[PDB]
Design a protein around this nucleic acid. Structure first.
Ligand SMILES: Nc1nc(=O)n([C@H]2CS[C@@H](COP(=O)(O)OP(=O)(O)OP(=O)(O)O)O2)cc1F
Ligand SMILES: *P(=O)(O)OC[C@@H]1CC[C@H](n2ccc(N)nc2=O)O1
Ligand SMILES: [Mg+2]
Ligand SMILES: [Mg+2]
Lengths: 363, 983, 358
DNA sequence: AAAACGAGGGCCAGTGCCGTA
DNA sequence: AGCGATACGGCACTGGCCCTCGTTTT
């Protein structure tokens, strides 16, 4: 509960002092910083990869924020339910099949009169009644697995089996914050009630081919708060006894990390073949890896200063270009996980970064 | 009713055989021992019509059965023995299917080699297995060579169809296939995977070699070392189980050449076709050598194992069958996923610890660390050579705007970049590991040019030797160490001096942080060396250790990890959780290769019993198949089954990952498996070997009376009686007993019982001294006990008396040694002599324990064979469908059907009864006790497991997945007779 | 025309029968989008964020609230970027002029009773000194025009108009020819400091940033593009007895689709699943038509895959299970070709990478 | 310019502890 | 004569043969 200063100093959040746990959990926060919205960006992209792309029978859906008939949407489930028939047409009535969407929802909050918005990633899984619970357990295990990675301590994320007021089975996902567990994602098995209510006239347009027969789809649903998740990984990244020596650094996963590498200039001053830094810069961004530019600077200070400055930004590697590299071609490199100087080649550094991220994505 | 335990039998009217003096001695012995407080609890006698006996005794019964069950196969074997061999073909045919080589080795295209018997050795390209590729088989008539469909270059898709070699003939006697490790070849037979069948049986030359002239693993270790005064005489009369070696032993011809390139396991399919003829030739050499070896072994085996029970038993024991389905694939995927996840977490935590401990390299602050000062801590920066010249130093050699007119300065910087890039490549050569990071960190990382490279420090372990010292605190101390053993633990004053000096140059050793760590630990060489924990300064020596081996690392000390000492830091409950993670994936770590590669052939809907299709299960586009366990029929000792996977398959534990492996063998719809476990075999065996030796009855011994007295059902067996002392239930007491029978070593029983009971050593030692009364007593300078009444004498010549040796009182080890003293077969009963390498004739022999164990375990294996032939006899005689066998030493399960399960269980009960009566008859009398005649537990259900109720880990919910339940049995099955018309 | 009907059957737009008109599409009123439209918009926004991330020196991404902070929905995407100005001043170290880009769903009233419409717009607020504001405005004009020109099938379809007034000293608007009527696609204004000075008075000593040892309150450039109007623009730009949408390879939602030719066999599904995973492993959108379940004709199949703007259609016959050869078929040339299954990934990747040029 | 010797890393089999029935 | 016995594997560690490259040589 003291890393907030690191969030303000390096903008992963707002610089406002009024950022209580309530203001963050309710979504009434003034907004996230560039590094924070980039972290959330990579997190949401990592969701979209491990939910929509790799698994077939899952298609993106665009639900509106309001209703044609003032208050907005509380959940992007209904808007997805409205696109059931058309998405049944493109899948040729082959269920199980799902619709995913990452959209911001608006929640009415009585502060003890206001309204707090928060980005949520929801997937509605239309599945036959015969295999509803199986898909529920499936998605439970796979979502929980998706959240238990990227973490330095997977023991914090937990799951809870719970029943509805009627009897419908469901599962909640918690993260262990320093003040207790907190809901981050919920999974429920809706018994085709809402679909029956939306289409009272003809229920024939709702029948989905289970295989040898058409059945009424049971509506599974999983909604994940990516803001609370972003904060969960944000707390998880930061460090706790008899270590004898401590350094301030948050260890985010190299995949969802906001800025990947950080390019700087050493020795210093050297003019004027420093345009190579520009080359390495565009070369790096062309491959889709985030790179922080350390060109125009006021420091001119101890290396520990900008090293800690990059460790507070969870930057993976610190590439240093000096005149000796201008001579031969071997730039310096400082990893975040293990603070250690290492020499390397340029294109070798590019491919090392690409391979680092790509392999980080794997086991 | 009567004689302290007997049932109504028709296995001989007479009989006593009273032995009045003998039973007076037994009664007096059991009175002074002394046990004379009978509970008088008669078990419910069973009155049923027994199956027809053939006479005269049950000996000739089982003999005639085993003979008629192995007669056609013996005929076929004899056809192989008197076989006149036609020479090898000048060239091998390159065509799919079988090719017959008869006159002058011509090529005759054949689908199926129609022969009574043949030798066989299949080949399979491991590079893309496990599908057969080549095969050669010779016959008493001519030769045969089978090629697989792998003759045309395609992009095949292997889902294990019915591609294996076809060998069985159609009907609309009969077959015998021999071969070295014949089970592996059987696994590659097309018609052996079917639910029904089969007539074809197999004979293994490896198993036969093991039965004739086999040797223990300890013997194997020093047999191959050839490259304890009279322990080198059996070196040339026996050999290892290799084909070349067993051929050099039984044939003694020229040494057969093996494939130097190992192309079937080292190379791909490409280089196989390039050397097709040669590989074919090699396979031919293999089947030929196998043929000769078999020819020389069959009569030797028939001589050493005269009883046909062993033959037929070995025949049925080779045709095992495990039916499975898609749930197998799901099991593989789920278990592998779980394993990868747990390993991911573990390696993540460990590499996290390894990353944050690398920071204390600067500057030289690692010397203060009481854990991290032994390793490298290197700093390399190499290398470069001069090529540029000359004589000039290369080490030192806010304006706001908005310009964009230089649109192509980007490609200028790019061009400069690439031009700068391709000029430094020739400066180094081979990319070495990261020099910046310390040596211990380099070793803890995968190579850069490695196809399986993972970011950060990988290869973390669990169970390594760097990482456990990296974090863990050490038994109320600070440092841990390794040299000849790790941190000492589990498996009249004494003093030792001290010393401290410097001389340079060695690594710096801190010992103040240790003392301060001890101070922090108690904040909540001598003394404190006995029960407490502390580390000295240097030395290094024992100075107070119990174990004589060490334990790198502490991986089974959870109760010694969740009780304070010892713990880890940093920190918290990370230690016990890490130990839990290790314990979970312990099984799947050393088995996943055997389980995932465990092949399985799926049979289509065209080649399966349609009566199963009629059964209300398909199931939902589900695939049904099976796998043959691939088991060596007879491996030492004694001639037990030997199988890489299914014999070491973990049980149902809610902790282990792949703990469901045993319960994945699910029976096809309409079918169900019925099996049983002998409770108990070896104990009652030793008991009988005792009482039959002492007198005539079964309860005329101190040890043999307690075995057949307890019931496992709402009662207390002998194992359970020793487990409630206390005492630990129940497998531990079993290990204690069976370990006591085959050598109750004082320190062994000490650290064992102390490990299992978890208490203090004195009271424990008292318990052991109380339990060591069973082995006591026993037998110029010598032990103070001889055949004379007193040992003290003066110049008394008696070297002719020092030839007798045997224990006294409770136990009966005297008989187990009596069979271990005979220089002749030693075969009770039956009744098969083993190994020219353990037979005391021309052997020291100094292998006593292995021979006592040989006796009792042989009785157990002959028990198994008897069970097999008995079960086979009344399964073909009556209408009991499903005769497939799946046996595991003590236990045995048959794949029956849902409508013939109770009668099959009845067949199991009858079998057990007859076998017990056999072991009773072979020593006398034919009469047998009550609580030992019939089985107590008969498992009847879909998948095989231990108890009828089964929980699991990976699938979490067992019945949640498509399963059923089990049923204890029992006494309710004693109402369905062996006759078809029941209920 | 006949374009709005092939966007319904191929799921570019949501299901409608009355609100399918061009006037309802130009309005924010919806019947939102279909999966193809969503993917198209996502790729378009991706290329938008890519065409501004390569821009020197640094532009920080932000997100603004939708409702009113004091109790309402947002009209423009400027205020939320003006709120994070003083904060982002610290990250740039008050060194040089700098901008803030953000893509968001803004609202606008559409006129019985009147309703509310939505539009996903991408904005860029470029803070720059008054002396070098107009020049940078022309710079962004050229760069945005070229940005719309790259993925365009015709550069003459996109136009750039100049304008000015008393509030905005100089502004530019990017139009698009349909040609049923040239429509607004993007606005580029040059607002003074009045917009920023109105929300921070005062003490306005924070607002002025360093400009070469000079303190000066920066003029504000307002970039505001529409991605929905742009989506429709490229849709009408791609519409060409044939009815094929030739969207740009870097912009097209699904770029490849693979079916089978031989009768329903498990092995075919295995190979196609393999190719599916291989193609998705290197970030290539692939439509799975091998499910399938019938595979009727081939011409109507190619028609369907041309109406979905698929670059290449792949056919996995029974020969592929022998030689590995596979039946490719282009869209822009419709040439039935054949090539080995192993060299497909490299071909697609090289073809996509070859479309990277300006 | 050209021949030779030592340092570094991979493939190999062997050994010590542990994993299960 | 003195003794847990029969197996089945796994991973961690190691000294030695072999190839590559550089430091060193006509
Ligand atoms: N360590 C160890 N060593 C040995 O040598 N055995 C062998 C001794 S006898 C044989 C069968 O034992 P069991 O089947 O596990 O037990 P039960 O006493 O036969 O009867 P139950 O009802 O199951 O308790 O294995 C077994 C061991 F476990
Ligand atoms: P499993 O169910 O624990 O045991 C199956 C059979 C019983 C005898 C044999 N076995 C097991 C363990 C040990 N140590 N030795 C054996 O011979 O496996
Ligand atoms: Mg038993
Ligand atoms: Mg047993």
């Amino acid at each position: 509960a003291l890393l907030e200063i690191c969030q303000r100093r390096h903008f992963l959040s707002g610089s406002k002092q009024q950022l209580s746990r309530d203001s963050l959990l309710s979504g009434c926060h003034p907004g996230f910083g560039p590094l924070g919205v980039e972290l959330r960006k990579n997190l949401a992209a990592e969701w979209w990869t491990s939910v929509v792309v790799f698994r077939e029978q899952v298609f993106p859906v665009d639900a509106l924020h309001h209703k044609p008939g003032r208050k907005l949407r509380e959940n992007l489930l209904h808007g997805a339910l409205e696109h059931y028939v058309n998405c049944l047409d493109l899948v040729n009535k082959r269920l199980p099949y799902g619709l995913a969407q990452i959209g911001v929802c608006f929640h009415p909050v009585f502060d003890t009169k206001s309204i707090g918005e928060k980005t949520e990633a929801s997937l509605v899984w239309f599945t036959p009644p015969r295999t509803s619970n199986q898909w529920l357990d499936f998605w439970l295990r796979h979502r929980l697995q998706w959240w238990r990675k990227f973490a330095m301590s997977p023991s914090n994320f937990s799951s809870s089996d719970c029943q509805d007021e009627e009897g419908r089975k469901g599962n909640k996902l918690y993260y262990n914050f320093p003040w207790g567990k907190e809901l981050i994602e919920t999974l429920w098995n809706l018994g085709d009630h809402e679909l029956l209510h939306m289409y009272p006239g003809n229920v024939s347009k709702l029948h989905g081919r289970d295989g040898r027969k058409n059945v009424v789809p049971c509506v599974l649903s999983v909604n994940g708060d990516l803001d609370r998740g972003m904060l969960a990984y944000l707390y998880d990244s930061f460090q706790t006894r008899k270590k004898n020596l401590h350094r301030k650094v948050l260890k985010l996963h190299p995949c969802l990390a906001p800025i990947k590498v950080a390019l700087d200039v050493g020795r210093g001053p050297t003019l004027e073949l420093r345009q190579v830094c520009q080359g390495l810069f565009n070369e790096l961004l062309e491959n889709g890896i985030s790179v922080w530019p350390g060109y125009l600077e006021t420091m001119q200070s101890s290396l520990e200063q900008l090293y800690s400055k990059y460790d507070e930004m969870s930057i993976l590697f610190t590439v240093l270009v000096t005149e000796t590299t201008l001579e031969n071609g071997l730039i310096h490199l400082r990893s975040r996980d293990t603070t250690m100087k290492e020499m390397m080649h340029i294109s070798k550094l590019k491919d090392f970064l690409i391979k680092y991220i790509s392999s980080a994505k794997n086991v | 009713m009567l004689s302290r335990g007997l049932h109504e039998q028709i296995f001989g009217q007479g009989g006593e055989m009273p032995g009045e003096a003998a039973v007076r001695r037994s009664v007096e012995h059991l009175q002074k021992h002394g046990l004379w407080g009978q509970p008088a609890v008669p078990l419910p006698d069973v009155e049923l019509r027994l199956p027809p006996l053939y006479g005269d005794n049950l000996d000739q019964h089982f003999r005639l059965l085993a003979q008629k069950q192995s007669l056609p196969y013996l005929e076929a074997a004899n056809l192989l023995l008197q076989a006149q061999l036609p020479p090898k073909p000048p060239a091998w045919a390159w065509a799919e299917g079988w090719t017959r080589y008869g006159p002058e080795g011509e090529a005759v295209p054949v689908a199926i080699p129609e022969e009574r018997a043949l030798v066989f050795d299949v080949e399979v390209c491991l590079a893309e297995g496990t599908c057969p590729t080549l095969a050669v088989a010779i016959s008493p008539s001519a030769w045969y060579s089978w090629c697989s469909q792998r003759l045309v270059e395609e992009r095949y898709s292997w889902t294990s169809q019915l591609s294996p070699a076809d060998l069985i003939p159609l009907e609309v006697q009969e077959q015998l296939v021999v071969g070295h490790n014949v089970s592996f070849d059987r696994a590659h037979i097309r018609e052996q995977y079917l639910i029904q069948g089969s007539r074809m049986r197999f004979l293994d030359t490896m198993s036969m070699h093991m039965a004739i002239s086999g040797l223990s693993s300890f013997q194997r270790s020093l047999w191959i070392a050839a490259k304890a005064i009279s322990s080198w005489d059996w070196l040339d009369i026996s050999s290892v189980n290799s084909l070349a070696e067993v051929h050099r032993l039984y044939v003694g011809g020229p040494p057969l050449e093996k494939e130097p390139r190992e192309l079937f396991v080292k190379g791909t399919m490409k280089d196989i076709r390039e050397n097709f003829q040669d590989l074919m030739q090699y396979c031919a050499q293999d089947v030929w050598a196998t043929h000769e070896v078999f020819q020389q072994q069959l009569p030797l085996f028939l001589e050493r194992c005269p009883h046909p029970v062993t033959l037929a038993g070995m025949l049925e024991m080779g045709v095992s069958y495990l039916p499975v389905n898609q749930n197998w694939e799901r099991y593989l995927a789920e278990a592998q996923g779980t394993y990868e996840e747990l390993q991911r977490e573990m390696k993540k935590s460990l590499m996290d610890l390894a990353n944050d401990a690398c920071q204390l390299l600067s500057g030289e602050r690692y010397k203060e660390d009481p854990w991290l000062w032994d390793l490298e801590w290197d700093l390399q920066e190499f290398k470069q050579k001069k090529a540029k010249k000359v004589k000039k130093e290369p080490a030192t050699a806010l304006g706001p705007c908005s310009e964009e007119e230089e649109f192509q300065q980007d490609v200028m910087a790019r061009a400069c970049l690439q031009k700068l890039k391709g000029t430094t490549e020739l400066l180094p050569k081979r990319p070495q590991h990261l020099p910046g990071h310390p040596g211990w960190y380099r070793k803890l990382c995968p190579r850069l040019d490695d196809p399986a490279w993972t970011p950060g420090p990988s290869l973390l372990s669990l169970q390594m030797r760097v990482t456990p010292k990296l974090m863990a605190l050490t038994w109320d101390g600070f440092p841990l160490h390794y040299s000849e053993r790790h941190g000492w633990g589990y498996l009249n004053l004494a003093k030792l001096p001290t010393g401290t000096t410097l001389e340079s140059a060695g690594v710096v050793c801190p010992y103040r942080a240790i003392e301060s760590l001890y101070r922090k630990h108690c904040l909540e060489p001598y003394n404190d060396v006995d029960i407490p924990g502390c580390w000295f300064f240097k030395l290094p020596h024992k100075d107070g250790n119990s174990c004589n081996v060490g334990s790198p690392f502490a991986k089974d000390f959870l109760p010694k990890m969740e009780d304070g000492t010892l713990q880890a830091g940093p920190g918290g409950a990370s230690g016990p959780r890490a130990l839990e993670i290790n314990k979970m994936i312990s099984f799947w770590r050393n088995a996943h290769k055997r389980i995932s590669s465990q092949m399985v052939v799926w049979l289509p809907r065209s080649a399966l019993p349609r009566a199963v299709i009629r059964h209300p299960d398909y199931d939902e586009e589900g695939l049904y198949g099976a796998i043959l366990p691939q088991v060596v029929t007879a491996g030492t000792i004694t001639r037990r089954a030997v199988e890489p996977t299914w014999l070491t398959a973990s049980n149902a534990r809610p902790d282990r990952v792949g703990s469901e492996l045993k319960a994945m063998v699910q029976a096809p719809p309409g079918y169900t498996l019925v099996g049983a476990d002998v409770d108990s075999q070896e104990l009652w065996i030793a008991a009988v070997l005792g009482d039959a030796h002492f007198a005539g009855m079964h309860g005329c011994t101190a040890f043999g009376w307690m075995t057949l007295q307890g019931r496992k059902s709402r009662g207390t067996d002998l194992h359970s009686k020793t487990a409630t002392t206390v005492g630990i239930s129940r497998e531990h007491a079993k290990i204690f007993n069976y370990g006591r029978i085959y050598g109750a070593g004082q320190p062994f029983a000490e650290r064992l019982l102390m490990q299992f009971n978890h208490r203090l050593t004195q009271q424990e030692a008292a318990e052991k001294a109380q339990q060591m009364y069973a082995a006591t007593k026993g037998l110029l300078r010598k032990v103070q006990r001889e055949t004379a009444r007193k040992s003290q004498w003066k110049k008394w010549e008696v070297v002719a008396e020092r030839a007798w040796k045997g224990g006294t009182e409770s136990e009966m080890f005297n008989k187990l040694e009596s069979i271990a003293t005979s220089d002749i077969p030693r075969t009770p009963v039956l009744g098969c002599c083993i190994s020219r390498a353990l037979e005391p004739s021309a052997v020291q022999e100094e292998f006593m324990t292995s021979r006592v164990n040989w006796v009792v375990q042989s009785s157990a294996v002959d028990y198994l064979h008897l069970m097999l032939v008995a079960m086979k006899w009344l399964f073909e005689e009556f209408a009991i469908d499903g005769r497939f066998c799946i046996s595991i030493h003590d236990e045995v399960r048959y794949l029956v059907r849902e409508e013939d399960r109770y009668r099959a269980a009845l067949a199991l009960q009858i079998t057990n009864l007859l076998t017990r009566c056999m072991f009773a008859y072979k020593l006398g009398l034919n009469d047998l006790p009550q609580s030992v005649a019939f089985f107590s537990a008969v498992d009847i259900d879909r998948c095989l497991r231990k108890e009828v109720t089964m929980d699991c880990k990976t699938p979490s919910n067992p019945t949640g997945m498509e399963r059923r339940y089990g049923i204890p049995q029992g006494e309710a099955l004693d109402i369905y007779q062996i006759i078809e018309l029941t209920k």
